[PDB]
């Protein structure tokens, strides 16, 4: 069994993807070769891909897309590209046409779970509680049916890039412009204060197996990029310090969401606990595997070690 | 300015796609080259592609994916591949990574408008009226919470392929077995009897401009494959014989749906009219351009002639 790991990407999470690649390459129980997509869209192969991993960033690539790599010597392809052009169905689409079995969600599921507006629309219709929001397009005046504090985010982000905590209605125009630098569409959600952040991992093809619920606590305005990746800043509490009844309800809503969206392989479902009420934030089809990441730590506490978790992903790709 | 038209495909609409290629190549005001994807998934380039167009169908191709095509020679790519692996975001995904401007909806919108379940879920949440429906996964037993007649369809279909009008529950199993030949997911919708079919074309990126409403009349059990593609069977009444406020509601609902799903370039939005109530059937991101297709005819009634429609489409790809 030979696996091809693709990491990097043109998205703002390029550096996160490379850190995720370190975590996967060190624990994958199968012979694996790395391929890096540099920030300019061009690929780096072989030894140049491994050298880019040591630098934690790869700005320039060698090979223009489609890369002259031998796809036939790989049984499974593992796309570990977070964000736009990687987790949104584009690379999955290319892999579908190539006929190569791949890890993770398909085209539709990847495209849906990456669009914060559309994913919430599907979830709300399925009877899953979501935070009340409104979608704002670029060049269109902001019509918000609710009062501040807000949470302005680009519809396609990850790693809290372009996300702002808006307190006044005056600060909305400036936060939307920051959001519009990464996407043509943005969401304006209602901020929950105080809030406990619950995260659960899922494994399986459509009908999943849930991991124990975990909690994230911090000393920052919100769970931002700095808090997410700089060591020791975030408090990863596995298992989550709450009532065993609401711990079961988190797992049930996660598995229900997974099935509705038709997700394959994996996902880490983020939740919000605000005054007894549970709300679903988002689903991430290609979650992080960085040293401070939640997904592999959740399954480690569930009796499923790091080499076993990655082995199960490769097996789900083939089935 | 040179356009690459991609037609054919591995989907059951392969033949319909080649007919659409004949329609676009005859009216497009730019020098255009054709690339054909054969039924086996292999590509036909240059002269072999133009010969495939005269033969009604291309069972076998020459080049495996990715094709050794000179992409740099083209400014805009026009994917005219109806159905699975063409209209679902897969080909759009490849084109995105290629850095190639292309006609029509992006990955997300293409995947959503192709899935008869997910599109209706997103639309129903947005407040757009849709027919009562249920989704059924392969192997799983159906649960239909409404009375017969039904319309059973493969979730990723086009050109009425695999669609059955079910009268008794004794016939549900056979209809689902037919539907499961084309997809791993099927939809069972409540059949509207009697029903009037309204179609409206949309042109533009996200905020589109609607064409006048057209009504389809025919003498067959439903608007099936042979009624759709045999000359003279499907009559188009343009402008549709509707009430003053109803013609406006159809256009407004189409533009609302188009904006929500974030569709780019084009879409033909199909509706149903039963007992004074309007229902959105589906959006088609790559509608047909065959001699019996409704999309170009919907626009020529709105002052946008065939060469101008295609000019707008190629131009919108660069906007
Ligand atoms: N409606 C809200 N109420 C309270 N806090 C919020 C809300 N929305 C976002 N946040 C805060 O901002 C962060 C953004 O998380 P989100 O999952 O929305 O960003 P992401 O970049 O999509 O997350 P990931 O990095 O897991 O993809 C949350 O972790 C939370 O701390
Ligand atoms: N719920 C329904 N009630 C009544 N008739 C229906 C219903 N659903 C489908 N039909 C009939 O079946 C036809 C095809 O359904 P649909 O429009 O969903 O097929 P399609 O293959 O998706 O159409 P296209 O060829 O435009 O893609 C309709 O035009 C209509 O005549």
From Swiss-Prot, chains A, B:
One of its GO terms (biological process) is peptidoglycan biosynthetic process. Mg(2+) 1 binds at residues 270, 282. The keyword DNA-binding does not apply. Its EC number is 6.3.2.4. The keyword Cytoplasm applies. It is found in: Cytoplasm. GO terms for cellular component: cytosol. It comes from the Bacteria. Pathway: Cell wall biogenesis; peptidoglycan biosynthesis. SUPFAM superfamilies: Glutathione synthetase ATP-binding domain-like, PreATP-grasp domain. InterPro entries: ATP-grasp, ATP_grasp_subdomain_1, D-Ala_lig_Van_CS, D_ala_D_ala, Dala_Dala_lig_C, Dala_Dala_lig_N, PreATP-grasp_dom_sf. Its cofactor is Mg(2+); Mn(2+). Keywords: ATP-binding, Cell shape, Cell wall biogenesis/degradation, Cytoplasm, Ligase, Magnesium, Manganese, Metal-binding, Nucleotide-binding, Peptidoglycan synthesis. Binds 2 magnesium or manganese ions per subunit. Residues 120-315 form the ATP-grasp domain. Mg(2+) 2 binds at residues 282, 284. ATP binds at residues 147-198. Cell wall formation. Belongs to the D-alanine--D-alanine ligase family. This is D-alanine--D-alanine ligase. It comes from Thermus thermophilus (strain ATCC 27634 / DSM 579 / HB8).
